[PDB]
Amino acid sequence: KIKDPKILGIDPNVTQYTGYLDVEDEDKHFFFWTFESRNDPAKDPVILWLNGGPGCSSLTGLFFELGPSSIGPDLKPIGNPYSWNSNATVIFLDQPVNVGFSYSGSSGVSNTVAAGKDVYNFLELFFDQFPEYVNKGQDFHIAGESYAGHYIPVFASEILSHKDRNFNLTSVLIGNGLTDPLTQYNYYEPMACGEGGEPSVLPSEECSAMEDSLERCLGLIESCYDSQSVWSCVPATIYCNNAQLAPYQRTGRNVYDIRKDCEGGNLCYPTLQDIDDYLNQDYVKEAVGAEVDHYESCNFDINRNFLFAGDWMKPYHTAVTDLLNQDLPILVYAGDKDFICNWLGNKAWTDVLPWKYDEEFASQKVRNWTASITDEVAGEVKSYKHFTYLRVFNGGHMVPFDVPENALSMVNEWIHGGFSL
Numbered sequence: 398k399i400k401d402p403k404i405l406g407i408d409p410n411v412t413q414y415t416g417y418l419d420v421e422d423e424d425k426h427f428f429f430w431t432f433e434s435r436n437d438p439a440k441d442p443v444i445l446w447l448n449g450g451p452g453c454s455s456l457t458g459l460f461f462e463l464g465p466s467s468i469g470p471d472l473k474p475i476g477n478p479y480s481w482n483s484n485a486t487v488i489f490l491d492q493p494v495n496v497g498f499s500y501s502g503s504s505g506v507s508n509t510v511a512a513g514k515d516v517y518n519f520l521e522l523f524f525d526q527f528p529e530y531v532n533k534g535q536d537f538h539i540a541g542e543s544y545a546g547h548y549i550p551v552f553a554s555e556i557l558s559h560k561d562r563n564f565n566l567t568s569v570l571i572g573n574g575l576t577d578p579l580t581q582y583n584y585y586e587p588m589a590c591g592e593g594g595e596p597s598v599l600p601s602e603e604c605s606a607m608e609d610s611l612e613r614c615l616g617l618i619e620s621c622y623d624s625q626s627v628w629s630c631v632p633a634t635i636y637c638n639n640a641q642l643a644p645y646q647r648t649g650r651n652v653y654d655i656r657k658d659c660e661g662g663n664l665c666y667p668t669l670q671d672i673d674d675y676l677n678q679d680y681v682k683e684a685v686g687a688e689v690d691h692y693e694s695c696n697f698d699i700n701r702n703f704l705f706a707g708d709w710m711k712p713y714h715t716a717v718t719d720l721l722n723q724d725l726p727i728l729v730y731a732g733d734k735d736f737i738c739n740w741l742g743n744k745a746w747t748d749v750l751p752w753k754y755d756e757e758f759a760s761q762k763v764r765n766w767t768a769s770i771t772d773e774v775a776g777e778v779k780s781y782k783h784f785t786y787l788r789v790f791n792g793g794h795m796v797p798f799d800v801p802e803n804a805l806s807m808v809n810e811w812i813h814g815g816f817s818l
């Protein structure tokens with residue numbers, strides 16, 4: 398049962414549609430909120446936006462970083478001066494199950510593999526009902542941030558797994574995501590210890606603490622990697638997140654933006670408060686016609702189960718290579734002002750992933766990239782065929798929120814410009 402946002406404020410002109418896609422036998426209720434290109438939906442690609450968590454709603458990217466609408470105290474919509482769908486029809490799915498607005502009576506989803514598994518089951522039901530996005534030869538891609546840096550590849554395989562498919566995937570976008578923990582994990586000390594733009598935030602004492610605490614942390618990532626057992630992956634998580642994330646947290650700096658400060662407990666980004674506010678409202682909860690009673694951003698439970706399952710420490714970075722091997726154009730982009738999923742570490746994981754153009758990628762030199770729109774160096778490229786690593790200058794964990802001009806700049810140009818920067 399689905400309604401149109403035709404009822405809510407949000408994005409007028411274009412033509413939005415929202416609601417649910419259901420799965421009988423499994424009893425799973427997917428929730429989405431689509432928007433048609435501000436230009437031509439017929440030409441313009443298709444996009445799957447994915448937030449992390451794990452267990453966080455995707456609406457958040459919608460009203461907070463790259464959607465059309467925004468949240469004012471007023472709990473009144475706002476137009477985005479640099480929206481994502483400006484030149485493309487976007488999809489705002491609420492995965493996993495029981496996230497944001499989706500739901501179920503009895504499931505699972507205590508891991509990634511099985512999540513994609515449901516995601517593909519929805520991509521085929523959606524494409525079905527709105528076949529108006531393929532036939533025309535409409536390039537479809539997927540994007541996400543943070544934990545989606547786990548999800549994405551895994552979902553990307555899942556999908557490509559079916560030759561059976563009712564659709565085509567063209568590329569992947571991953572922003573400030575967790576992908577190859579084993580490698581990204583050493584980038585914790587460097588980035589907080591004064592080596593990645595902003596300056597040292599931790600007493601050198603604390604720094605050496607991270608450097609001792611490292612060896613141990615890592616052998617744990619390995620064991621998880623090679624074993625994939627709860628017995629190793631679980632302590633690898635707790636231990637590493639301990640030794641390396643907490644010291645920064647103590648300082649009470651924002652975790653998504655080293656420049657901004659945020660003390661422990663409250664929000665780092667309060668405005669998202671208004672968001673959970675606008676969502677639950679009586680009129681707003683109506684339109685969408687969502688069958689949920691109370692909407693939360695994230696679901697503690699889901700988070701917990703992923704954590705208690707080993708999740709976070711599994712080498713999903715492997716999937717990346719297959720996809721590259723299967724000639725899939727990939728884009729790894731990083732806000733350079735974020736601590737939780739640094740550009741230092743996302744840089745490096747890239748710099749070492751194996752794939753056919755393995756040596757050439759590592760050869761190719763870094764170049765300064767010019768924002769499509771604003772005409773200003775906005776980051777730093779490393780490109781090689783369908784695999785590109787970009788460093789977004791003056792960016793936090795949610796790059797679109799911080800630099801909208803540049804994001805879209807980086808966006809369309811990748812969406813359009815021929816899978817290169």
Ligand SMILES: *[C@H]1O[C@H](CO)[C@@H](O)[C@H](O)[C@H]1NC(C)=O
Nearest residue numbers: 435436483484809810813814
């Ligand atoms: C998308 O939208 C605008 C506006 O009507 C258009 O000028 C632009 O050429 C479009 N696509 C790109 C990537 O240039």
Ligand SMILES: *[C@H]1O[C@H](CO)[C@@H](O)[C@H](O)[C@H]1NC(C)=O
Nearest residue numbers: 531560561562563564565566
């Ligand atoms: C994907 O588009 C349609 C979907 O089912 C299919 O007919 C076509 O063969 C696929 N594209 C290829 C050739 O990669």
Ligand SMILES: *[C@H]1O[C@H](CO)[C@@H](O)[C@H](O)[C@H]1NC(C)=O
Nearest residue numbers: 763764765766773774775777
């Ligand atoms: C990046 O371009 C060159 C890199 O070799 C450098 O001279 C320059 O400082 C950079 N561009 C800027 C910051 O205008």
